[PDB]
Structure formats: structure tokens, C-alpha cells
Amino acid sequence: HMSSKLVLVLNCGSSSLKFAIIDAVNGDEYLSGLAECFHLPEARIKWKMDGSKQEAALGAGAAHSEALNFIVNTILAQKPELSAQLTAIGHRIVHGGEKYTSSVVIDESVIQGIKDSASFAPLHNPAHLIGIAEALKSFPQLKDKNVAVFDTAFHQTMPEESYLYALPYSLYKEHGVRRYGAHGTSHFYVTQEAAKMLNKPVEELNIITCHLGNGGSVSAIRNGKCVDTSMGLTPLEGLVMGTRSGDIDPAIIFHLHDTLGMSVDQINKMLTKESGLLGLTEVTSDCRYVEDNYATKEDAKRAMDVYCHRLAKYIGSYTALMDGRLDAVVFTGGIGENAAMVRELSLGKLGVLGFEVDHERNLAARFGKSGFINKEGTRPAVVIPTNEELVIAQDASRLTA
Amino acid sequence: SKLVLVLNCGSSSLKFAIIDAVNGDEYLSGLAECFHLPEARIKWKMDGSKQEAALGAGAAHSEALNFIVNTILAQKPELSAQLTAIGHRIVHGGEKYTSSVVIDESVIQGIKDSASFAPLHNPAHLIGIAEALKSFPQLKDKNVAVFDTAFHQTMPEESYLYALPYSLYKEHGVRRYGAHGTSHFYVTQEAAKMLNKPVEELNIITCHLGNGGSVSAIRNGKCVDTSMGLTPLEGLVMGTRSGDIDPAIIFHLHDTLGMSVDQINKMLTKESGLLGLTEVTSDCRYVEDNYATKEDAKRAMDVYCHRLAKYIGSYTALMDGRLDAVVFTGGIGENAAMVRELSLGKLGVLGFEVDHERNLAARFGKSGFINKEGTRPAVVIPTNEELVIAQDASRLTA
């Protein structure tokens, strides 16, 4: 009566490949790893399987081909019973444009769809296609069982009110300039879980979801559907992030260019690689540093306060999307699951809404534990660990198997 | 009777008024636009009925203020001796100026230094000051500068810093400064009067909607956050200004659509906002009148109200547990009933419920509470920035 449906989850960048084998039915992880430092002498691949840690090098100047070669011919070859059990392959895509509102099975037209959306993700989307092309060559058996899962799909339920910028409308009509967001897969996941935790249908769910980790985004959920999100055309907009600025006076770009002599490419690299938490603390991108030192160091305090200021205002701003009812706020992601004070300090600014954190409960909801962190009688607040890998596995399985 | 000459100088236009700083009585109005052009003309309304004349062809501030002395104040010489001070509107006071000040050489120097932030407006204000001191010799020690950025200087670093490299603030003063400060200040003081409580205990969110749009968060009578930033571009949807955008849109337009920095800069400030949304006009009156019958107006109304409603919502994070009222002011804010209603209608979670009958009454220079009786207060207060200039000018020279 019981069954397993193992799916290979792949997350391909231009110099990285995050891979995992998940049983879509129950969520069991059979393998996970990371092949990094592509086209360099350092080129290595790390993995936890049974699960203990193994590290090997693929060779100086290694590409995605040998990255899947090592998985097939070295890792999967030892456990052939595991290899045969594979029923599908899921691919994460950063940007799916307006064409893709949900996960889809990969064919020639999807390859083109990803290629056409590449305009919005010029660095990430091309790398997905390389990984997609290698998965078809390394796994011939699963060539009609490849599925694409879009970071943006979940945000396509947004009404025009939310996706349109106050720019020339022609810019949308003929160039697709629109709010698309990201972390859609995570935003979806925590919504489904919040239903379990609030003991109510996902269809009746009015929550504000905060994915804070590798990038940061807040989303406004109305009746289970996303009606607004913090990231925009690109992942640059919204929250204070590890290395990204988020919201700025757009005119700053012009002030950096015309007054400070910085090139478009210089400014682009600053807002993307040199801003955010690295910008505020002239030290590091790591939120763990700020979480620990904000009580003792000035640079850490200024970073924390700006961060939490930004987060609190976004939660507060999405009351405009709630149509009179807010069931709970949700925290998730590397930071959202682990950083207690970030949750305490940012929600503490929202007393008007009815938010106040319990310290004892807040600390308890860390390092994988899920829980309600709100003080009793106050508006619900949940820590729910995310699982983007699982969503890709579930979707890849449902549409293929 | 404390009479003040209020001056608002720009690149090609000098806007002027004589206001009584005791009771707000206007004794004169004016506008000397089209400088350095054949269209050089004046439009001076007065206690005695209005008229329009022509300054000349290729005119400057020196001629404008002299025309006020030799012609405008020639017919009415009773109020010339009545002048006690002069008030200058300054766009950017930088970090230096937290309140209005008496103009000496260090203030001139201060406005020069700030001119990095308002390169078009601040040098022009200086020419205005220059001519005001020579055209009105009697009042050379009685010129007062009122700054659009002054009121927001009570902002903590939590609000005024962008998540950029900290050196950009340290070395270059890159910071949130805002605007409409003289308006946000005024309506704050008035809200206290209407809410029958002290300004020092006043927690409100203020919305100046008109020539540009700005929302401010006030805690205990002090501004703690504002929607506009380094420049007036950031924040709300405005006439031609985009407000908040994904910063990357600029890089996309530049790198993908081949647009120049100048071309994107023009678009964002002159081709966007309501003009961008409705491919028709920047005029908000179009949006107010047609949002129920025309698609383009509806599109623009919804997006406008969405941005405003979110901003008001976002500033609950600054209220520290208590929000007394939301305030609407400015050309748009005082008169656009449905703009007020549609945006506050999105904030039901917060307890906002617009009373339509009250909403319609509070229009055209009329103040009033537009909220339903048991619900969270929402007030319309007509701003008076010229009076605040007159008051500051008069109070600091008595």
C-alpha cells in the first residue's frame, strides 16, 4: 500500500551545482551535495549520503558534465539500487516570466520559455539550461521526466495592482517589466504548513510570509494565494539582505553615477556584492555576526536596527493586502529559522498590529524546531523551517509519475 | 500685524507672497516665471483684485524682485513699511539644519554645500537670497531660510540609512533626507489641535499628496521616518515620478534595452507615475473622475492607492504601539476624496473605515475627520506652507 517516488533535485549555477535525492512521498533524503569552483584548479564535489561527509575533486577545470559524471559514475554506481529507484528529475529555475504560473514538464517549448525569460535572469537561467542539457545526457531514461520548478511561479497569482510599477505602461506591455519576486517555492511551502499549524484550510489563509536567508523576501498571502511580494523584477528589491541593498532611492544610482563618477557596472556590483549587511557592518555578510554582537558592537547594532526596521515595515505594509484579516506572520529561511532576536526586535516594532514576541518561546523555535513565538493573547507568529528541495521533488513526481 | 515676504525661487520661476504671520492673511501673491525667455511674465494677485503683466524677454530674478519694489509695491505703499522679515524656501538643508535659521554667510555657505543634493534648486535659491538682500536693504538682517528637509532631521540612523556601504554616508552624506517638511510639520501641529492632545504625545502618519507625494511617520511630535529619500524620487506614485521601483529596473533598461542613464533618469522623473500608468496625463483629477469608467484611470488609481495604503501600513513599525490618526494634505490629499477612501479601505486590519459623507464634506480647503464614529481617526487638514515660512521668519526676528 505504501510507496516511494525518488526524485533527483538539481539546482544549477554557472560555477555551482546543488544536488539532492528526495523521496517525494514522505520527504526522505537519500543523498545531498554540492559541486563547486567550476573552471578552476580547486574544482571539488562534497556530499552526505548514508549519511556521512565525503569530499573529492573532479579535476582542474571541471564543468557540469563531470559534475553529473561523478554523481552517476562514482556516487550512484556504488549504490545501483538507489540509481534504478529514480522516477524523475526536478530543476529549479530562478525566473519563469509570466508564461509559467506553475511547475511544468520540460520539453522544447520550456527550454525556449526559460531562454526567453533569461532576459530577467541573465546569469542564472543560462546555467539552468546547461544543467538541464546534462541531465538529459547523463540520465537518458528520464529524458521525458524532467520538470522545471520556478522561483517566480507562486507569485503569478498577484493582481495588476501589485505587479505594476508606476512606470510607462508600454514597458510592461512590450518588455514584461513587472514584479516577479523570488523564493516562491519556499513561500508556497510555509503557506501549506501554516494551514496545518493554524488548523484551517489553505484556501482561507491570510498570512504574511518572511523568507530570510540566502536573499530575503516577504510575501502577502490572501486566501492561500500570493497577492504581493517584496522582490521585484529581480531579487534586488525589498528587504535588507546579506550582500544586497534592497530598497533604495532610485535616484541614488544617478547620484553615484553623476556626482560620484561610478559606472553602471560599478554601481551594479555595489548594490549586489557590496551592500546590505556587508554594507552596514563594514565587516561581513553573515547574519550570525550581527545576531550575536549587536549588544556589544556599534557596527553590528546599526546593521541589526536597519535590518529589523526594513522587515517590520514590510510586514506592516502588507496589512494593505489583508482585506481586514491577518491570521499570523510566518518566519522561515536560514535567518528566519535561527535568528531569534531578528524575530523579536522586528515584531516588537509592530505593537499597533498586535505583535509581541515571547522570549522563552522564540529561543525554543530554533535550529529546526517549528513553533509559535507570539506572547499569549497577541497575534500569532510562527517559525516554520522551509524545504524548497521537497517542493521540487513533489512537483516533479506529481507531473511525471 | 506681522507681515512677511515669502519667496520661493527656482531655475526659471520666482513664486512670491506677503503673508501676515499672526493670522495667515494673504496681502499679495505672485509668480514671475519664464526667466531667460520671451515668455517672461508675471501673475500677481492681491487684496485689491488680480492681474497679469509681462516682465520682458530674457528676464532674471534681479528684475522680478525689483518689479515688486518699483511697480507692485508702488501702487500699495502702505504694506511696504509693514514688512518685518523675508522667508526663503530651501529644498535641501543637508544634515546641518534641523530647524529654520536666520540667513548669514554661513547659511549661504551651508546651502552651497548642500547643493550637491539639490543641484538644480539650491544654487537658484542663492540668487534669490542675493537679490532679496539688495532689493530690500532694510531687511538684510531679517532673511530666514526654511528647509524642506529640516523637519525629517529628527530621524534615527535606523530610518535614515540605506543598506549601502557605510562609507557612502560617512564620506558623501548619502542618506534619507525627504521633503514636504514644512507641510508635514504644519499638519502635525494642526492634528494635535483637532485631536485635543499635545503635539509632544502625538503619534500620527501624515500624507502630503500634491506636487510630489510624501508620507511621514511621526512619534511624539517628531518625524521618525519619511517616504522620500536622498531626493524626492523615492516613495509614492506621483504625477510623473515613478516612486519606488526595483533598483535593478535601471540596470535592465540600460543593459537590455540600451537606454542611457540620462534617458532612464528622464523617464523615471518625467514619464512615469500617473503619466506612466495612464498613458494620458499626470493630472490626478483625471484619475479621480474616471477610475470607474476608464481602464487607464482604474489602473493608475489602484496602483496609486496600493502604494499609499502600503506606506501608511508600513509606518505602524514606527508608532511603538500607538497610532492616533492618519492625516491627508496637499493639492491631491485635500481634494481627492476617493483616493483617500480607496487606500484607507485597504487597511481594514488596522481598523480604518472611511465615512463617505464625512469624506465628501472634507474637500476644497475644508478640514475634517473622514473616519466613521467608532473607528481609528483619519483627518484631512489643508496645509499652509507659506504661513509656516512667515511664522518662522517672524518668530526668529522679533
Residue numbers in the entry:
A (entry chain A): 0 to 400
B (entry chain B): 3 to 400
Paper quotes:
Acetate kinase catalyzes reversible transfer of a γ-phosphate from ATP to acetate in the presence of a divalent metal ion. In the present study, we report the biochemical characterization and structures of S. typhimurium AckA (StAckA, NCBI accession: NP_461279.1, residues: 400, molecular mass: 43.3 kDa) in two crystal forms at 2.70 Å (apo, Form-I) and 1.90 Å (citrate-bound, Form-II) resolutions. StAckA protomer consists of two domains with characteristic βββαβαβα topology of ASKHA superfamily of proteins. A cleft between the two domains forms the active site pocket of StAckA.
Structure of Form-I StAckA determined in the present study represents the first report of an unliganded as well as mesophilic AckA. The asymmetric unit (ASU) of Form-I StAckA crystal consists of four nearly identical protomers, as indicated by the low root mean square deviations (rmsd) of corresponding Cα atoms (0.43-0.84 Å for >350 target pairs). The four subunits of StAckA present in the ASU are further organized as two dimers resembling the dimeric structure of the archeal enzymes. The subunits of a dimer are related by nearly perfect non-crystallographic two-fold symmetries. The accessible surface area (ASA) of an StAckA monomer was found to be 17,920 Å2 and upon dimerization approximately 3,061 Å2 (17% of total ASA) per subunit gets buried. A total of approximately 81 residues (20% of total surface residues), of which 23% are polar, 53% are non-polar and 24% are charged, contribute to the interactions at the interface leading to approximately 23 hydrogen bonds and 8 salt bridges. There are also a few water-mediated hydrogen bonds between the two subunits of the dimer. This analysis indicates a stable dimeric interface. The analysis revealed conformations of StAckA that were similar to both the open (Cα rmsd: 1.15 Å) and closed (Cα rmsd: 1.23 Å) states of MtAckA subunits, and in conjunction with fluorescence studies, suggests that StAckA is also compatible with the inter-domain movements as observed in MtAckA. It is possible that the structure of Form-I StAckA protomer represents an intermediate state in which the active site is accessible to the solvent and ligands. Intriguingly, examination of Form-I StAckA as well as other structurally known members of acetokinase family revealed a similar cavity at the dimeric interface.
